Design a protein around this nucleic acid. Structure first.
Ligand SMILES: [Mg+2]
Ligand SMILES: [Mg+2]
Ligand SMILES: [Mg+2]
Ligand SMILES: [Zn+2]
Ligand SMILES: [Zn+2]
Lengths: 37, 150, 140, 118, 80, 146, 29, 183
RNA sequence: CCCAUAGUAGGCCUAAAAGCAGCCACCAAUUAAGAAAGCGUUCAAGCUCAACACAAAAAUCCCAAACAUAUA
RNA sequence: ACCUCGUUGGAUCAGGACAUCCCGAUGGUGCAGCCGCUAUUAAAGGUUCGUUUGUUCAACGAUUAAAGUCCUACGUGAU
């Protein structure tokens, strides 16, 4: 995960999910895209 | 923003904008088209025998080959939206044709039945079943088409 | 898979444009160029020819060929070797509508190229647009 | 029944009770849920303590406060009891508690499509 | 997957679930990777049969079902 | 309502489905809430109202099916979350601290270790702002933050 | 430290403003 | 010359003289030879670095053969380096050509957000829309009491707290900040 | 979500640069089509889109207690 | 718009912050492994001895898992 104030989907498979209180960008194909609010 | 005097802050708060509030919420309160129209109207009379299929599982090349085999005969394959086809059924007085055209539909208009060879071609592809049609204002099921072919 | 090439019938072994490009799938360049030269003999020699080779999973060649290109064909018909630069104002050769029709007569006959439209308009309009895109003026 | 109090909102997780033992590193911050699990009376005791006036009578007043986690009460206290005060909050009923007559009385609001999995 | 058969009677009341099912899954776009399957469409309430040569036969009366339901069931069975 | 039954062979059967009560107070209304004059007159604890838009296991029903407004669907969803967290739907479950008006899921809120100064206090949310416009019979408005 | 305006303060100011508006009216004639 | 012309870090011939940030802008408040622009919703000073970012971003993102851009603001002249004071409501960069808002708004908003004051990419249509909806707000507001009315009438002795400039700013401007929701 | 045939790798040069190195036009087929708006190939090849079809932080220890629903 | 110039170490005891130097957990990697780099969480515990220097600081020697950045009126001379 990388901490970002603005979450941006980088590829098609990046998806936004609100978990444990904050937003996350998860990505199976490119786990490099993992972002945390 | 630098802090305002408290009296000025009170002034701004009192003068804040107040939108009107309706008593009841309004939301909770109560030529390609004609070209297709004329084309289908003309086709319904030009054609003598009509059938429909679901040529959507085929690839580009496979559909092109099927089109070639059909054009070898005088039969012509057609595609038209169901949205505009549904009114055409009642317009042309085809009541029994309503529960036949849903989802992908591909018409097979013709005047001379090569249906025997067409069914032979379909046989080597165990899918794309023939669907009901209506030759010269006479609805025919698949068994009817098979009997007419034979 | 289908491999598309526009090689010239004259030079059947240019090298890079056929060797490395075809070697990824696994090909017999000798057989491929032998069949290409066979087709070159069957047809006029020294002319670009589109190919529709399909490399089957069983490692066999089914070379399918048709008419020559349209760009080089039109340039030869108009007496042009290299195309125009601007292609919107520059013109080097002129082709008459009768000539366009005559060439189209032997154009809507190929299977792979899909140029199989019954109406003559379907193909004459397409070739006219191609000529307009190229540096050729349509006379009358 | 102080063990069965209910907080509004997410106070069980957000409200924090802070205390200091007086020794360096002795600052303890414990959430409402943790404090309730440890002592089933601390939450109500602290609420009453904070609401009482901040003078020397406060602990004398607290001596008159008797908090019991569950329904059991000492027999002497039970004999002492005089009145029962009404509960400040009326407990909402559950569906399991609603009577079939009430359910029938409440109208059906919408026509669910017949062809729906649900 | 080994074999699959789709049957329906559009002459009778139409059932779009099976129609969409065969339009989607019974496509060469899928069969290219799912080559082991043999698909047949015998049209004449509807019925989708799937025969697995190992031990399984799956019958789907796709009258009240929907395309999504039947495709999900088919995928789950394929996973096995 | 159609249900899928297996025996393997599986088929769907349509069973009894409830119908809207006759004589809506406000016919020709956008959503059922408006049709029945409940625009701002239901809360998290109105389980009789809420459960009519709920899957048997507690999940909400889609707006397209329910016919609710966007705002009314949001309000019902939030009220249902609050009712579930308050334990007012013991029968609608997937398969011990008493709460109510809990806006956030209990597992996603961190303790307020440092409540700010008086002018910048960190307040604990109560209820949901989506119900801010509910009919208020009290002199003071609902306090959404404590 | 920042200060904030309460509904009571707003109402007090509005009451004074209403009195002054009536004063304007009665001085206008 | 569709691209923005390069400006100088400092003026060749320093002039003598002629706040300069507070209050609504009186010059270059309307479109001229274009359809899109960067509207300055606040007051501030533009440095040569700001101008260079304007220029580079606009030039690189812009299509030269279908879009043209012009400086709606002078070069830095006020010494401190040199700056160009900008008042709220002034257009900083204007753009025209055979393009559309949706096309230019991306990079226009990027540069507006990088500007030293509140700024917004606005078309002619959107500028007119915001003006008309502000007019609608001030026409339909249900508050009997407005800053304009109170300040002009000196109700409550409020001019003891307000500035003389407040009788013209009408509360919509405070310091260098333009409050757009203030009616 | 579905799906993308083809005049042709449109031409100049560019080893070749084809839709992605660049500038020139930007036509045309079926019914549905950009001589291509984005990835990737030295160049191709492969993928999509458009087209049909259906917010935060600091150092002694947080800092009234609490409260959403009884008529102004 | 000339030049020039105006409290801190050490000893002792350490209290505290985390913006973590080591020790713990986790995500990413241009992470094969060893290694690193980066980011989230973590302040319970630890964070060396010497040479030269008024040197506040600095360099150097040998080590260490590490030889953290700070606040505490140089933290602390009625020690
Ligand atoms: Mg940390
Ligand atoms: Mg210090
Ligand atoms: Mg001392
Ligand atoms: Zn991704
Ligand atoms: Zn409604």
């Amino acid at each position: 995960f990388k901490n970002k104030t603005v979450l941006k989907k980088r590829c098609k498979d990046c998806y936004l999910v609100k978990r444990r209180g904050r937003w996350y960008v998860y990505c199976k194909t490119h786990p490099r895209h993992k972002q945390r609010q | 923003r630098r802090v305002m005097h408290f009296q000025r802050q009170k002034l701004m708060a009192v003068t804040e904008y107040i939108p009107p509030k309706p008593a009841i919420h309004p939301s909770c309160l109560p030529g390609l088209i004609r070209l297709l129209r004329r084309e289908i109207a003309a086709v319904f009379q030009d054609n003598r025998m009509i059938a429909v299929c679901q040529n959507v599982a085929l690839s580009a090349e496979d559909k092109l080959l099927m089109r070639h085999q059909l054009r070898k005969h005088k039969i012509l394959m057609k595609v038209f939206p169901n949205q505009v086809l549904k009114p055409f059924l009642e317009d042309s007085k085809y009541q029994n044709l309503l529960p036949l055209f849903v989802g992908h539909n591909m018409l097979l208009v013709s005047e001379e039945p090569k249906v025997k060879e067409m069914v032979r071609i379909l046989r080597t592809v165990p899918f794309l079943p023939l669907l009901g049609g209506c030759i010269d204002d006479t609805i025919l099921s698949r068994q009817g088409f098979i009997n007419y072919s034979k | 898979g289908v491999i598309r090439a526009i090689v010239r019938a004259g030079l059947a072994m240019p090298g890079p444009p056929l060797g490395p490009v075809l070697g990824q799938r696994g090909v017999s360049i000798n057989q491929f160029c032998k069949e290409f030269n066979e087709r070159t003999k069957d047809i006029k020699e020294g002319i670009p020819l589109p190919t529709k080779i399909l490399v089957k999973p069983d490692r066999t060649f089914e070379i399918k060929i048709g008419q020559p290109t349209v760009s080089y064909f039109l340039k030869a018909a108009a007496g042009i070797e290299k195309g125009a630069r601007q292609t919107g104002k520059e013109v080097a050769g002129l082709v008459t509508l009768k000539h366009v029709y005559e060439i189209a007569r032997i154009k809507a006959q190929d299977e792979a190229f899909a140029l199989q439209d019954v109406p003559l308009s379907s193909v004459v309009r397409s070739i006219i647009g191609s000529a307009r895109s190229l540096g050729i003026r349509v006379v009358k | 029944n102080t063990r069965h109090i209910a907080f509004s909102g997410n106070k069980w997780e957000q409200k924090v009770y802070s205390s200091h033992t007086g020794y360096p590193g002795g600052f303890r911050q414990v959430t409402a849920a943790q404090l309730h699990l440890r002592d089933p009376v601390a939450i109500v005791k602290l609420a009453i303590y904070g609401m009482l006036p901040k003078n020397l009578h406060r602990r004398t007043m607290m001596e008159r406060l008797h908090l019991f986690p569950d329904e059991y009460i000492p027999e002497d206290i039970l004999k002492n009891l005089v009145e029962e005060l009404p509960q400040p909050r009326k407990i909402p009923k559950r569906l399991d508690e609603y009577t079939q007559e009430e359910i029938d009385a409440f109208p059906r609001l919408w026509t669910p499509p017949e062809d729906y999995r649900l | 997957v080994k074999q699959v058969r789709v049957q329906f009677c559009p002459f009778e009341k139409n059932v779009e679930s099976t129609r969409t099912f065969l339009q989607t899954v019974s496509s060469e776009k899928v069969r290219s990777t799912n080559l082991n399957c043999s698909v047949i469409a015998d049209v004449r309430e509807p019925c989708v049969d799937v025969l697995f040569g190992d031990g399984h036969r799956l019958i789907m009366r796709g009258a009240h079902l929907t395309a999504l339901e039947m495709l999900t069931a088919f995928a789950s069975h394929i996973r096995a | 309502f159609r249900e899928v039954v297996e025996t393997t062979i599986i088929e769907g059967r349509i069973t009894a489905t409830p119908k809207e009560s006759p004589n809506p107070p406000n016919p020709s209304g956008q959503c059922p809430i408006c049709r029945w004059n409940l625009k701002h007159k239901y809360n998290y604890d109105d389980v009789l109202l809420l459960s009519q838009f709920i899957r048997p296991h507690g999940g909400m029903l889609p707006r397209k099916i329910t016919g609710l407004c966007q705002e009314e669907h949001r309000k019902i969803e939030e009220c249902v979350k609050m009712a579930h967290r308050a334990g007012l739907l013991p029968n609608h479950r997937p398969r011990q601290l008493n709460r109510y008006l809990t806006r956030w899921a209990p597992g996603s809120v961190k303790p307020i270790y440092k409540k700010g100064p008086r002018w910048n206090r960190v307040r604990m949310p109560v209820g949901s702002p989506l119900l801010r416009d509910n009919v208020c019979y009290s002199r003071t408005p609902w306090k959404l933050y404590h | 430290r920042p200060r904030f305006v309460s509904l009571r303060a707003k109402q007090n100011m509005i009451r004074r403003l209403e009195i002054e508006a009536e004063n304007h009216y009665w001085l206008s004639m | 010359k569709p691209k923005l012309r390069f400006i100088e870090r400092a003026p060749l011939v320093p002039k003598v003289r002629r706040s300069d940030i507070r209050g609504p802008s009186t010059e270059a408040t309307e479109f001229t030879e274009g359809n899109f622009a960067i509207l300055a919703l606040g007051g501030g000073y533009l440095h040569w670095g700001h101008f260079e970012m304007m220029r580079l971003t606009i030039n690189r993102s812009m299509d030269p053969k279908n879009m043209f851009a012009i400086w709606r603001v002078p070069a830095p002249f006020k010494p401190i380096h040199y700056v160009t004071p900008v008042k709220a409501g002034r257009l900083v960069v204007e753009m025209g050509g055979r393009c559309e808002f949706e096309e230019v708004q991306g990079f226009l908003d990027q540069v507006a957000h990088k500007l030293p004051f509140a700024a917004k990419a606005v078309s002619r249509g959107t500028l007119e829309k915001m003006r008309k909806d502000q007019e609608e707000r001030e026409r339909n507001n249900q508050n009997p009491w407005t800053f304009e009315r109170i300040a002009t009438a000196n109700m409550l002795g409020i001019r003891k707290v307000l500035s003389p400039y407040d009788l013209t700013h009408k509360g919509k401007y405070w310091g260098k900040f333009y409050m757009p929701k203030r009616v």
